[PDB]
């Protein structure tokens, strides 16, 4: 279906413990494929997906220098925002940035992203037209006037319209067997009696990719969404994800409850029972 | 825009010079560049709000700094012959990679071994030919500054106390009078072409002004002849018929 | 490792034709690419600034392209005028491995000479009042050759512009303190050159 490539950034200042901590990661859909950490012994853009390891040395030399400059620029911004908000140099503060682009099934650009945050709240964001900004407070408006004068949005628009979609298509083809080959979930139902008159039916969904999944319970064909305990989708540790849904059922009426699993890796939705 | 001081500088080897620069109003970052004959334009150092930002292959004997008023100074100490180049100063609003730098007029530095070869030029003007007047109805005056070293010269034409640029042509680079000698004297020619009716009026005054940049006052002069200091030498003509 | 090369080093073309200036860089990790013109006695003037992810920029009769995957850049000058005569410099903003910040990397430059079209050629050699000889009003196809003897001094061609009359004229001066009949014997003077 639709695909996306996003880069996350986090700079956390540590006044007295040296230079601020800087960690940036890159994702294609739900797959981490590059990472950079300033606390590493050798700060370099490192691969995290076997399909990205086929890029030459000029690729990793470029992304390393771009991440190092991003780290140093955020260090200047951490000191800059201290004067914008009149904050002491003793406290720790966070700077976050995220940019990327979404593409449709035809590979064409669907939406480009670029937005920053400070201490967990929105700061300044590139609007959907790629030609304007949205500032959150008066401090971000100072940044907005600087970026408009320096014409920063013109470079962002060029990247989101060109380099972001072109290199995203390259990753989707070079990792076609993992980025475009969905992994269906392994499904099974467990039984857990609480009392002598009620039990718990937990519908398990394990080892699926991408993370987008829909777990629904049906009692004689009616959705039990009000009484369904649903947990957040969680990473298994091997690029796959997990999720389960449990409903408290009275003892003796287990076969009257059915689980329904929706996933793009399934050509047909799967209905399971306690067995 | 960007202003650089001084404009020209001629000194001896082992000396030490200072080049001043003033960025644009509101510019917070300053840049220094070196343009020589054997390397082209080369980056030296960059300061941003009085703090060093980027640094190129700059020598230890080159010292630079940025002051709280955002102006910058570049100290070139223990000068060698190879240090003779054109030094530019540029500035930018900040560190935005999407913006541009604004360059100043530059400072031209020439380092010599001994200063006994420095000489001011002799300026002379040549009245147009009557054959050119009768053939083209136009009159061309030619100015010529001969015997000067080095080539730190700026030629200009003046008509009735006002500098003129129309009908003015000047050689792009002075030529060596004896190219066999490495310390040869230079020469520069220029032309000014006006209408023959304008030249025939004896009321108009034409002046060829050659601005020579020579030794500064920091260099000791122990020679019989006068010190070839930065001076202006001129020649004039009035026109007749 | 970042190196910029500009070709050709010099280019003399007649007035009005279109022009193509080439530029190449080694490290494709750039933040932008600029084109400057450098007039003698003055600094550098920014002509075009191409962003990192952009592919082309246009301002007036100037168009420049950028291809980072190939590391090339081309500056197109349409309908070249004599006022475009300057040294065109190709610069690149890029970082360097294991250093503080990024900087500009310039090329050697392309000395462009847009020779003006002479409306009414009229080669002639005059003599001026010594306090020199004046070969003037010759077409741009005329080649000025340096004197064979070192004691005879000859300058190169130079274009003055009388703007109030739409008149342009090339000229050169030859003198020696040792006649204007054999001053420009080395140059291919037109035989129609008038000798008064």
């Amino acid at each position: 279906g639709s695909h996306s490539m996003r880069y996350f950034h986090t700079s956390v200042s540590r006044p007295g413990r040296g230079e601020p901590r800087f960690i940036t990661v890159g994702y294609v859909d739900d797959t981490l494929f590059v990472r950079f950490d300033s606390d590493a012994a050798s700060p370099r853009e490192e691969p995290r997906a076997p399909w990205i390891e086929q890029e030459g040395p000029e690729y990793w030399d470029r992304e390393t220098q771009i991440s190092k400059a991003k780290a140093q620029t955020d260090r200047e911004d951490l000191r800059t925002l201290l004067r914008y908000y009149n904050q002491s140099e003793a406290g720790s503060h966070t700077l976050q940035n995220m940019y990327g682009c979404d593409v449709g099934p035809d590979g064409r650009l669907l939406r480009g992203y670029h937005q920053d945050a400070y201490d967990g709240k929105d700061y300044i964001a590139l609007n959907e037209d790629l030609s304007s900004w949205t500032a959150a407070d008066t401090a971000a408006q100072i940044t907005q006037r600087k970026w408009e004068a320096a014409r920063v949005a013109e470079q962002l628009r060029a990247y989101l319209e060109g380099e972001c979609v072109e290199w995203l298509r390259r990753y989707l083809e070079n990792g076609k067997e993992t980025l475009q080959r969905a992994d269906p979930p392994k499904t099974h139902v467990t039984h857990h009696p609480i009392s002598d008159h009620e039990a718990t039916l937990r519908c398990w969904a394990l080892g699926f990719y991408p993370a987008e999944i829909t777990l629904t319970w049906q009692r004689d064909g009616e959705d039990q969404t009000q009484d369904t305990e649903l947990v957040e989708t969680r990473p298994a540790g091997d690029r796959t994800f997990q999720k389960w849904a449990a409903v408290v059922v009275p003892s003796g009426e287990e076969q009257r409850y059915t689980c329904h699993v929706q996933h793009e890796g399934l050509p047909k939705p799967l209905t399971l029972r306690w067995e | 825009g960007v202003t650089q001081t001084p404009k020209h500088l001629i000194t001896a080897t082992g000396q030490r010079v200072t080049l001043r620069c003033s960025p644009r109003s509101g510019d917070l970052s300053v840049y220094w560049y070196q343009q020589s004959l054997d390397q082209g334009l080369q980056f030296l150092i960059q300061y941003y709000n009085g703090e060093e930002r980027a640094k190129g292959n700059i020598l230890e004997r080159f010292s630079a700094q940025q002051f709280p008023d955002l102006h910058s100074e570049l100290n070139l100490s223990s000068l060698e012959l190879g240090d003779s180049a054109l030094y530019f100063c540029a500035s930018s609003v900040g560190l935005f990679s999407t913006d541009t730098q604004y360059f100043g007029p530059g400072t031209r530095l020439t380092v010599l071994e001994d200063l006994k070869n420095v000489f001011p030029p002799e300026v002379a003007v040549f009245e147009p030919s009557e054959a050119e007047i009768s053939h083209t109805q136009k009159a061309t005056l030619v100015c010529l500054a001969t015997g000067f070293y080095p080539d730190h010269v700026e030629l200009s034409w003046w008509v009735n106390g006002k500098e003129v640029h129309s009908g003015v042509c000047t050689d792009p680079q002075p030529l060596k009078e004896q190219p066999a000698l490495n310390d040869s004297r230079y020469a520069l020619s220029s032309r000014l072409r006006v209408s023959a009716t304008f030249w025939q009026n004896p009321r108009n005054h034409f002046r060829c002004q050659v601005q020579f940049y020579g030794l500064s006052e920091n260099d000791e002069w122990t020679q019989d002849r006068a010190k070839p200091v930065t001076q202006i030498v001129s020649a004039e003509a009035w026109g007749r018929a | 490792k970042q190196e910029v090369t500009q070709i050709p080093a010099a280019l003399s073309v007649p007035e009005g034709e279109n022009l193509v200036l080439n530029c190449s860089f080694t490290d494709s990790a750039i933040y932008n690419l600029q084109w400057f013109r450098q007039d003698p006695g003055k600094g550098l003037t920014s002509l075009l600034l191409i962003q990192s992810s952009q592919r082309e920029q246009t301002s007036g009769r100037l168009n420049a392209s950028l291809d980072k995957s190939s590391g090339r850049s081309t500056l197109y000058i349409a309908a070249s005028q004599p006022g475009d005569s300057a040294t065109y410099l190709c610069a690149v903003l890029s970082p360097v491995q294991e250093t503080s910040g990024s900087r500009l990397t310039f090329g050697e430059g392309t000395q462009l000479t847009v020779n003006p079209d002479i409306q009414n050629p009229d080669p002639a050699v005059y003599q001026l009042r010594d306090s020199v000889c004046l070969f003037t009003d010759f077409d741009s196809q005329t080649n000025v050759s340096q004197s064979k003897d070192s004691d005879v001094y000859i300058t190169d061609k130079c274009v003055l512009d009388m703007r109030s009359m739409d008149f342009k004229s090339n000229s050169a001066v030859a003198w020696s303190n040792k006649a204007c009949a054999n001053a420009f014997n080395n140059s291919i003077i037109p035989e129609d050159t008038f000798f008064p």
Partner: peptide, 9 residues
């Protein structure tokens, strides 16, 4: 690939 942009706040 990553965005090449130096935009201080």
């Amino acid at each position: 690939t990553r965005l090449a942009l130096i935009a201080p706040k």
